[PDB]
Amino acid sequence: SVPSQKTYQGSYGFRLGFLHSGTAKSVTCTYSPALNKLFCQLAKTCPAQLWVDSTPPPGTRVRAMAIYKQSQHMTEVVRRCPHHERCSDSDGLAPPQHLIRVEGNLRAEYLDDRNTFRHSVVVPYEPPEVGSDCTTIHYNYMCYSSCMGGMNRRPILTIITLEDSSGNLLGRDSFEVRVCACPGRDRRTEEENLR
Ligand SMILES: [Zn+2]
Numbered sequence: 001s002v003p004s005q006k007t008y009q010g011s012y013g014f015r016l017g018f019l020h021s022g023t024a025k026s027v028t029c030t031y032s033p034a035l036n037k038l039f040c041q042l043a044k045t046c047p048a049q050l051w052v053d054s055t056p057p058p059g060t061r062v063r064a065m066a067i068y069k070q071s072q073h074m075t076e077v078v079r080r081c082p083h084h085e086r087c088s089d090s091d092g093l094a095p096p097q098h099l100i101r102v103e104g105n106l107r108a109e110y111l112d113d114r115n116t117f118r119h120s121v122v123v124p125y126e127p128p129e130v131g132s133d134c135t136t137i138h139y140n141y142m143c144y145s146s147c148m149g150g151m152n153r154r155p156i157l158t159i160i161t162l163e164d165s166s167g168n169l170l171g172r173d174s175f176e177v178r179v180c181a182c183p184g185r186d187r188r189t190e191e192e193n194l195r
Pocket of ligand 1: 144
């Protein structure tokens, strides 16, 4: 099977938000609204904002999962390459095979679906803090898009789902991701090609 990637705000008006980091050669993570694509360096912080019109119930969670963007590769589980899954760089919670990790959240849970074998990381949804209007989750991508034997230059999409305590769908959003050496230059190049 293949997880749905259909945008769905749901009853709570759920949607993602990204910072405006620019395209300076030095940038480590930058989002392109025109391409709905996040460009980031290997294992660097990727801030993802969670916006809602109304607060969902306590027990609500937020899950992140990657799938290949190209339909001919959609059924293939996205995982870290043969090299990175063996580099012993786990933070003590993320299985070494998982591409996506959540930074600084001890309540993060990593799932290896017993039926689909797909990987995902889920955390409890926390309402915005006093003074804040959104909640932010910091993600890390643990392989380059170019890793041989892994993504192998194939583009991926990250699907973020808001779910209830049973795992039922409440909202969904998604974006393409390219993990590369120079996010600033690649974003500029791809946006130029689009122009
Ligand atoms: Zn890799």
